[PDB]
């Protein structure tokens with residue numbers, strides 16, 4: 001009010017932010033998965 | 048002076064002077080109620096709904112609302128949509144060049160207490176921090192029915208303005 005303008009003061013929250021990604025499995029539960037690589041462009045096995 | 052005196056929320060006209068002042072107050076508040084000129088501030092998902100009030104389903108011209116998008120002719124301002132850090136001095140400046148019997152109404156949930164962007168970095172956590180807002184219109188698509196209801200709430204407040212009765216200092 002007293003500067004009759006807006007001022008930029010450092011952060012204060014009413015409510016602290018709460019993420020919930022702390023509950024998380026370390027390994028990604030998706031599997032390895034198959035490929036779709038073309039039979040031309042993957043390496044031929046020896047013999 | 049009397050040690051007991053009725054509150055201005057509780058007082059009734061008893062002097063003929065008070066009947067005159069109350070009817071004159073009613074005429075002033077009544078012209079303030081009917082003619083009703085906000086300013087188009089709307090900027091975001093909360094601005095199409097302001098246009099939905101101008102749409103031919105929920106008309107505002109039948110209420111006397113019309114958007115003189117020029118803040119010197121405006122009675123009130125409808126803060127609508129989100130409010131960013133980058134804009135907010137312009138919001139203050141648009142509030143500055145308004146005439147004195149003014150109000151401002153916070154359409155939209157971002158416009159009060161941040162809303163959906165309460166934890167962003169470049170956002171004002173509701174337009175409380177800029178202008179003194181008298182009616183909030185909640186709703187994240189704040190309903191045309193709700194926006195009009197906010198206007199009727201504000202008009203009830205306008206009926207209780209008592210600009211004339213305070214010359215007697217009640």
Ligand code: SF4
Nearest residue numbers: 092093129155156157
């Ligand atoms: S009230 Fe809803 S639509 Fe409007 S700015 Fe906030 S989040 Fe967006």
